[PDB]
Amino acid sequence: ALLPILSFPDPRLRTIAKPVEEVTDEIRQLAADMFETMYAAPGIGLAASQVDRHIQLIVMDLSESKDEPMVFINPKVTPLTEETQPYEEGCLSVPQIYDKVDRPSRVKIEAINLEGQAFEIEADGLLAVCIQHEMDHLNGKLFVDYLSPLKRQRAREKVEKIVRQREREK
Numbered sequence: 001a002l003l004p005i006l007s008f009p010d011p012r013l014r015t016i017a018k019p020v021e022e023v024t025d026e027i028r029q030l031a032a033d034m035f036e037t038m039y040a041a042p043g044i045g046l047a048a049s050q051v052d053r054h055i056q057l058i059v060m061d062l063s064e065s066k067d068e069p070m071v072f073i074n075p076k077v078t079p080l081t082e083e084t085q086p087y088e089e090g091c092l093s094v095p096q097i098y099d100k101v102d103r104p105s106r107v108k109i110e111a112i113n114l115e116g117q118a119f120e121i122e123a124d125g126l127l128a129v130c131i132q133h134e135m136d137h138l139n140g141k142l143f144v145d146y147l148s149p150l151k152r153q154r155a156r157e158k159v160e161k162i163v164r165q166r167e168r169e170k
């Protein structure tokens, strides 16, 4: 199916994804389910932590046409500067909440793809924003954690009320 997307404040959003040991039948099903779940939501990124899988797996497609899929496995991201570029973000695990967040602007990304081909690229703008955001997810981090603790407290509430009306709707 398409999988449930976990929601703030669920404490399974804090689990530290463990790495992947090999690409088996299951991890391929999951990378495929996740793409569906991400395109369905809709969104441009997804970490396995968000659909209750604490494994270092990230899918992504940035295009308007929903046609440039990307698949990161045991990634590693290094900041190439202290020059944080601000960026209005939102999260599927944090619905209808948005504010500005500062992260490094230039970043190196290292990982393998679905078939295990290694790549190692240098990343700008939205790619570099998206990747850091999904990496945060794998290490139990939400973009609200970059905010003042009341602006996030109020976000525990806006979301809990949203989910209430998700449930009364479903």
Ligand SMILES: CCCCC[C@H](CC(=O)NO)C(=O)N[C@H](C(=O)N1CCC[C@H]1CO)C(C)C
Pocket: 042, 043, 044, 045, 046, 047, 050, 088, 089, 090, 091, 092, 093, 098, 129, 130, 133, 134, 137
């Ligand atoms: C820039 C951060 C991108 C992270 C990817 C997320 C998906 C997610 O919640 N992953 O953890 C997304 O598509 N979020 C969207 C989002 O934040 N957007 C829309 C596209 C880019 C960014 C601008 O607000 C939705 C929720 C509105």
Ligand SMILES: [Zn+2]
Pocket: 090, 091, 092, 093, 094, 133, 137
């Ligand atoms: Zn998110």
